[PDB]
Design an enzyme around this catalytic site. Structure first.
Site, PDB file in Angstrom:
ATOM      1  N   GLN A 150      76.364  61.862  27.627  1.00  0.00           N
ATOM      2  CA  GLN A 150      75.951  62.641  28.739  1.00  0.00           C
ATOM      3  C   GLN A 150      75.369  63.755  27.547  1.00  0.00           C
ATOM      4  OE1 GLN A 150      79.929  61.942  30.467  1.00  0.00           O
ATOM      5  NE2 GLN A 150      79.174  62.232  32.518  1.00  0.00           N
ATOM      6  N   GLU A 151      74.567  64.911  28.423  1.00  0.00           N
ATOM      7  CA  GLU A 151      74.037  65.541  27.765  1.00  0.00           C
ATOM      8  C   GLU A 151      73.377  65.681  26.229  1.00  0.00           C
ATOM      9  OE1 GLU A 151      74.381  67.696  29.834  1.00  0.00           O
ATOM     10  OE2 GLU A 151      72.942  69.606  29.135  1.00  0.00           O
ATOM     11  N   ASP A 152      72.233  65.065  26.353  1.00  0.00           N
ATOM     12  CA  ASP A 152      71.644  64.927  24.645  1.00  0.00           C
ATOM     13  C   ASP A 152      72.441  64.660  24.123  1.00  0.00           C
ATOM     14  OD1 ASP A 152      68.653  66.809  25.222  1.00  0.00           O
ATOM     15  OD2 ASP A 152      70.159  68.079  26.441  1.00  0.00           O
ATOM     16  N   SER A 153      73.255  63.417  24.187  1.00  0.00           N
ATOM     17  CA  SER A 153      73.036  63.024  23.089  1.00  0.00           C
ATOM     18  C   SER A 153      73.360  60.963  23.056  1.00  0.00           C
ATOM     19  CB  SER A 153      75.034  63.202  23.208  1.00  0.00           C
ATOM     20  OG  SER A 153      74.929  62.203  23.942  1.00  0.00           O
TER      21      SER A 153
END
Ligand SMILES: [Zn+2]
Ligand SMILES: [Zn+2]
Ligand SMILES: [Zn+2]
Lengths: 46, 310, 49, 67
Positions: C7-10
């Site tokens: 989740q979110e830019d990983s």
């Protein structure tokens, strides 16, 4: 005990092992490159 | 609290007090022992100039000045530029003129300037210049030869530094990059040796054979032969009444005429600086033993049975 | 979307691929040191402290 | 720098199929057929070899393997 000191391009030991100035006999270069240790290490193939 | 030099261990006198840099602490191994008001050496610490513009270093509250050449640092400087107000009220001189500081020594600084000029004109290393500058300060502080020409003293220091580092220049060479006479540099040389109560090594053929053969674009192999020619010539004691430089020159000629290159006497003369009659005489003296002087591994072009005479 | 560890830019990246040398790299740092003569009465020396 | 032993995505050994491939391309201009004969079915194993660049060949050419 010697401190070897292979030189560039000539591919021979410099042999210098004292305080005298660094410069490989016969070969005109004056860059050195201290030789590999005989002391064993280890590497895991992991 | 004056009794320290690193000692304050309560239960037992100190034997050692190790510095654990990472913890910021002073430790005493055989017990437990912190005692520290830690300084990892204030010189690493103030060094917090980094990510900000470092090329200009706004943080530099400490200039180097290089005191170990001198002794007496004095004051800062000032200089023109806000557009002005800075009186001259009527005349044309904004604010005020700057002021000289160290005048008694300004010609020591002026000597350091001359040594570097001289030094670069023959492409010397900074290590020579650093030895030269060092010798000079020592000679200056003793004030034993203050009467002599300051430029002669700097030139002689340069000659000594060059010989001590095991790559001597001739008196002829240092004279060339200077305005001081050969006789006067030589004279000062001896006097400095007397002043510092010190001595240098004796020049050999080998110390000059390299530079000369190099500047004449001579092959590496021929340079090697000349070296051997020179070394053997001194070994056979064929030149008891001759200088090693002249013998070096004569070996170079013999080698060159034994190869395809064949540099003329005038050319060798021109690099060596000695008179070409001196070479010719020296050659005439070594010619009777030429066969014995060459390396057995040398690739001959013209045999000695065909080696010219002049 | 999977298990949300991305989740979110990983990203979830495959470990066995990094074992088989995926994107592995070598890092070299060259340290340099000088033997400064440093003027009048001091000297630096390369030796066993 | 030389083709890796075993493809990243799955494991099928793949260095062994490199020397064979340069021979096939020299023989035929059929990259499709070349990869097929070597047995590189699925494309992860295929990208491995198809997208490799053998830098080693230029690298070996320096005279000083001595330092
Ligand atoms: Zn060499
Ligand atoms: Zn203690
Ligand atoms: Zn695969």
């Amino acid at each position: 005990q010697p401190m070897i000191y292979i030189c560039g391009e000539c591919h021979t030991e410099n042999e210098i092992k004292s305080r005298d100035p660094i410069r490989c006999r016969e070969c005109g270069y004056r860059i050195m490159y201290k030789k590999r240790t005989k002391r064993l290490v280890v590497f895991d193939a992991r | 609290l004056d009794a320290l030099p690193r000692v304050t261990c309560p239960n037992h006198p100190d034997a050692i007090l190790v510095e654990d840099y990472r913890a910021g602490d002073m430790i005493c191994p055989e017990c437990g022992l912190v005692v520290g008001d830690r300084v990892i050496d204030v010189g690493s610490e103030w060094r917090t100039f980094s990510n900000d513009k470092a090329t200009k270093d706004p943080s530099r509250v400490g200039d180097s000045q290089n005191p170990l050449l001198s002794d007496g640092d004095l004051s800062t400087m000032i200089g023109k530029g806000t557009g002005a107000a800075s009186f001259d009220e009527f005349g044309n001189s904004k604010y005020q003129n700057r002021r000289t500081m160290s005048s008694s020594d300004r010609a020591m600084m002026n000597a350091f300037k001359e040594i570097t000029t001289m030094a670069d004109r023959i492409n010397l290393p900074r290590n020579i210049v650093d030895r030269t500058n060092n010798l000079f300060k020592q000679v200056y502080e003793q004030k034993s030869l203050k009467g002599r020409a300051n430029d002669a003293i700097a030139s002689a220091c340069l000659y000594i530094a060059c010989r001590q580092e095991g790559v001597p220049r001739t008196f002829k060479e240092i004279c060339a990059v200077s305005r001081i006479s050969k006789k006067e540099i030589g004279r000062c040389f001896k006097l400095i040796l007397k002043a510092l109560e010190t001595s240098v090594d004796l020049i050999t053929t080998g110390d000059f054979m390299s530079r000369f053969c190099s500047n004449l674009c001579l092959p590496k192999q021929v340079q090697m032969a000349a070296t051997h020619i020179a070394r053997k010539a001194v070994e056979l004691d064929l030149v008891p009444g001759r200088s090693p430089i002249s013998v070096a020159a004569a070996a170079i000629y013999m080698a060159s005429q034994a190869s395809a290159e064949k540099r003329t006497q005038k050319e060798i003369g021109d690099i060596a600086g000695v008179a070409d009659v001196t070479i010719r005489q020296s050659y005439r003296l070594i010619y009777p033993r030429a066969p014995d002087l060459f390396p057995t591994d040398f690739k001959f072009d013209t045999p000695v049975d065909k080696l010219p005479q002049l | 979307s999977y298990t949300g560890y991305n989740q979110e830019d990983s990203v979830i990246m495959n470990r066995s691929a990094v074992d088989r040398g995926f994107f592995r790299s070598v890092f070299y740092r060259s340290y340099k040191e000088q033997e400064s003569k440093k003027g009048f009465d001091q000297e630096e020396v390369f030796e066993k402290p | 720098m030389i083709i890796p032993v075993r493809c990243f995505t799955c494991g099928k050994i793949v260095g062994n199929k490199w020397e064979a491939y340069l021979g096939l391309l020299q023989a035929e201009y059929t990259e499709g057929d070349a990869l097929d004969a070597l047995g590189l079915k699925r494309y992860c194993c295929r990208r491995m070899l198809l997208a490799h660049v053998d830098l080693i060949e230029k690298l070996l050419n320096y005279a000083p393997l001595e330092k």
